[PDB]
Each structure stands twice: as structure tokens, then as C-alpha cells.
Ligand binder design. Structure first.
Ligand SMILES: [Mn+2]
Ligand SMILES: [Mn+2]
Ligand SMILES: [Mn+2]
Ligand SMILES: [Mn+2]
Lengths: 288, 288
């Protein structure tokens, strides 16, 4: 049985991603968010509710990526160096999820927080979207998997990392780009820096598997991929309508969702499916 | 679907272990080991071979714990806070595994390193012991697991964490306690500090599951755990004879194995099975 041997490279990229994960390491104790209270209380009731709801959704996606998406993909890799990278990325999703709790503690009472998590658990669109992604992961709960199954779990993972988070990341960035909730915005920026490398790395692993599939299997997963993209898009459009109508931002968020969907396709080596539009300028300032 | 909510504790211990994992965070870049070359060359060929072989075995065990033991147990754990802790522990196993490669780079040529990893992969006792442990993990590759299956995976995990590593950790500690290979010894001591908390934590989780089992299931797993302890012990005694007879340390290592087996049992809430014997004084100095 093989031990991981970093003296003999298994690919040309795992070492660089391993080092970059670690170079980017952080935890929530590094960013105090109490100073956000001054701008939090200036938000309207509707703005505050939207913020808490999107944070709840982000927490769900990180919970499932750390607890299903990374572990179940990694188990089925033959490349022990790439497995190492995914184990660390999965741990970072748990750091991310805990950081949302750290933000919540400043922004809400204990009772308000538990309300948000009950709203998350019972939310039908969050249940639907998480169910779609995790179905690909849970297919891997068996000793022998096909390359089509593993590839599609990697596609679902890239779509979570590079696409499904972004209807939520929009609002912390949009507020921070205006000088509101800037400390929480700094945390979200650290999370995004991690998710961006996660999506690139899993997309590299997916492209490697794709190249090994027969032409017939390639056709089949290309179809599944394009269908999954649009199945998720329909849910995302319903989610943005629900969250952002009250604050007048639906079309701006939708534009941001499409921009990030294109990035996820690119991470898989695929052509964009939505027209190119420039990112919202305030969001761009929030990333700065 | 539920998101992890650290504002509502799921148990009385996961937060403390989460914080301690992180407090103990380290990577190999932090300890240069080039200065160990001066004492490395003082060793005989037999001492050097033993050292490289035991590090190879340690690397194998950490590879399997990061790539199978932590991910498959955590996937099936219901408690989302404890799941978070296990994800971090699994990532640390990959840090540990990579740190062995860092030691190897100082102590051996590229060709010698690849020969050690071939010796690991073909080794019959390493294959047997790793296969015994991973057979319990691989039983968890199914959509839903029984509590007996999950408990036995946690037992196997504690036995790896608290027991199987120690026939290997002996030698770096013994040499470091004589002032030899002290930089590598410092790394091993950081690894041990992590494995000790890993074994305590998984043992807490195991005791919780055990107490939820029916009486008939408890009787079954109690017997299986005692058999497993002694099945592994027979293999360990063959391993120590093979590795350490050339350098006269077999009985010393065996005493250390029994000492650590007792600690594994205690981590599971079980009584010691081996006579108490005081720790070797040189090893004790290497831990200091
Ligand atoms: Mn994340
Ligand atoms: Mn991620
Ligand atoms: Mn370890
Ligand atoms: Mn461990």
C-alpha cells in the first residue's frame, strides 16, 4: 500500500497548490468585526435581513463542501499529492463556516442567530440547490466508482466553489465597496481568495479525468454538465428574486451570478455560456 | 438541510478541540533539519536504515489517516461541530506526511528515497496492518452506516492514532533523547502532540456512539475491539523484531508499544490490557 512521496511528483501542480493553500492560511480570530456595528445599525431592517439570510446560505454551502464535497472526491483520487491538497481545502471550508458564526455574533442576538439557522434548514430553495450538488457527492459512497461519476462530482464541486457561492458573496462585497460592514467584508474577501483556488484546482483534476474518458462518456458528461449549469441557474434566479427584491438589487446580483458561472465553466476548460458583462463597480471596489 | 451553527453547542468539547487544533497549527517550513546531517553521519548503516524504514511506515499511516480514516468517519458523523474538528485533523495528517518527506530530503538521496517508498509499498507487515485498519474505514463507503460500523471505524482510528504509530515514533525519540537528529526529533514531537489530541478526540466520539448502541451490539463490538487489539499486537511484535533486531532495541520498543496500546484503550474508555511498565528514560528525554 502506497504512502505519499513528495520526492516523486505525481503531477505538475499539486505542490504549488499545497504551498498556496498554506500561504493563505487564516482563522477568524485574526479579524475582529465589532467595528462593523456602527454601519450595521444604519442599515434598514430589509438590508439586515438580506445580509443575515445570504450569510446563512453561504454557511450551508461551506458546511456541505467541507463535510461531503472535499472528503468524498478526495477518497476516490489515486493521486496522493492531490488528495493532500483536497484534505487541506476541506479543512478550510470548516474555517470559513466557523467565520460566518463569528460575524453573526456581532450582528445578531443568540435568538436571532438560531432563527437564521432554522430558516436555512427549512428553506426550500437552499434544500433544492444543496440537494442537487450533494447528490453527485453521495453517489461516491461506494467502494468502486466510475470516472463519469467522479468527474461529475468534480463538476458539481467547481460549480459550488466558483458559481453557487456568488449570489451570497455579492452582498457583503457590495456593502463593503460602499464602506459598510468593511471588517466582515475583509473576512469574505479571505474566503473568496480560498474558493477561487479551490475551484481552479478541482477544475484541473476534472479536466485530467475528462481526458481519460471514452468519446461516448465525454459526450454524456458534457450533456450532464450543461444541464446541471442551467438547473442550478434556474434555482439561483429564484433565490436572488427572493432575497434581493426587497432591496432592489435582483438584476445586479443576476449579472454577478452569470459572470461567476462563466468562471466556473472556464475552470473546467469549457466555453462561457452567458454574455460578457462588466462586474458591478461597487462590488469591484469591495474586492479591492 | 442543516448548516453548522457554532452559536448553539452540539456538545461540551468540540469547540475546545477546534481551538486547540488551530492553536497547535504548524507546517514543515518552520523547522529546518539540515543541521541533523552532522549526527546522521555518526550513525551506522543499520541505524540509518532503521530510521528511514520507521519514517516510511509513519508516512503510510498518516497517508491512510488523512485520506481514508478522517474523511470517512467525518462524513458519517451527525454532529457538525465535531465533523469540523475531524476535517482539520485530517488536513494535519497530510501536513505530517509531507513533513516526513522534508526529513527524507536531508537524510537521503532522491534514489534512496524512492527505494524506501518502494519498500513501504511492498512490505508485508505494513500491508497487513494498514489493510486491517482501512478495512473498517472502507466499510463506511455506503450511503448509510450502522452505529456498530461507525464505532468500529472509530476504534480502528484510535488504535492507529494512539498505538500503531508508536513502534515508529520510538526511534526518532530515542535518538533525539541522545542528542542525535534533534531537528527531526522536534518535528516528530509536533506530530506526536497532534496525534495525542486526535486519539483523545476520536475516543470521546467512540464512547458516545458506544453508549447509544443496543446491549447486543455493545457486546459484539466489545469483543471485536479486544480481538482487534491483539490481532494488531501480534503484527506489531513481528514488525519490531524485523526493524529493531539489527540495533538491539526490540524489547525496548515492545514495552513502548504496550504503554501506548494502554493509552489507546484509555482513550476509548476501556481498561488497560498490558502490565504497567515505566517509560524508557532515553525516550522520555527525547520527548522533553
Ligand atoms: Mn469555503
Ligand atoms: Mn472552497
Ligand atoms: Mn498524523
Ligand atoms: Mn492523527
Amino acid at each position: 500500500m502506497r504512502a505519499v512521496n513528495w520526492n516523486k511528483k505525481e503531477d505538475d501542480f499539486s505542490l504549488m497548490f499545497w504551498k498556496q493553500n498554506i500561504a493563505q492560511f487564516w482563522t477568524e480570530e485574526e479579524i475582529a468585526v465589532s467595528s462593523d456595528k456602527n454601519t450595521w445599525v444604519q442599515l434598514s431592517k430589509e438590508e439586515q435581513i438580506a445580509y443575515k439570510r445570504v450569510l446563512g446560505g453561504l454557511t450551508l454551502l461551506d458546511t456541505k463542501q467541507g463535510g461531503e464535497g472535499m472528503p468524498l472526491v478526495l477518497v476516490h483520487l489515486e493521486n496522493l499529492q492531490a488528495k493532500s491538497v483536497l484534505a487541506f481545502m476541506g479543512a478550510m471550508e470548516e474555517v470559513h463556516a466557523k467565520s460566518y458564526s463569528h460575524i453573526f455574533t456581532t450582528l445578531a442576538t443568540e435568538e436571532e442567530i438560531d432563527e437564521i439557522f432554522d430558516w436555512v434548514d427549512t428553506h426550500p430553495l437552499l434544500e433544492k440547490k444543496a440537494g442537487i450538488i450533494t447528490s453527485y457527492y453521495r453517489r461516491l459512497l461506494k467502494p468502486e466508482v466510475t470516472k463519469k461519476e467522479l468527474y461529475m462530482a468534480m463538476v458539481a464541486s467547481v460549480f459550488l466553489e466558483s458559481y453557487l457561492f456568488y449570489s451570497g458573496f455579492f452582498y457583503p462585497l457590495y456593502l463593503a465597496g460602499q464602506g459598510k460592514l468593511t471588517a466582515s467584508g475583509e473576512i469574505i474577501n479571505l474566503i473568496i481568495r480560498d474558493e477561487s483556488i479551490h475551484g481552479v484546482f478541482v477544475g484541473i483534476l476534472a479536466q485530467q479525468i475528462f481526458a481519460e474518458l471514452s468519446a461516448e462518456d465525454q459526450q454524456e458528461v458534457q450533456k450532464e454538465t450543461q444541464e446541471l449549469l442551467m438547473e442550478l441557474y434556474e434555482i439561483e434566479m429564484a433565490y436572488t428574486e427572493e432575497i434581493y427584491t426587497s432591496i432592489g438589487l435582483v438584476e445586479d446580483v443576476n449579472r454577478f451570478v452569470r459572470y461567476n458561472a462563466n468562471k466556473g465553466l472556464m475552470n473546467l476548460g469549457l466555453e462561457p455560456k452567458f454574455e460578457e458583462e462588466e462586474i458591478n463597480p461597487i462590488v469591484l471596489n469591495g474586492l479591492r
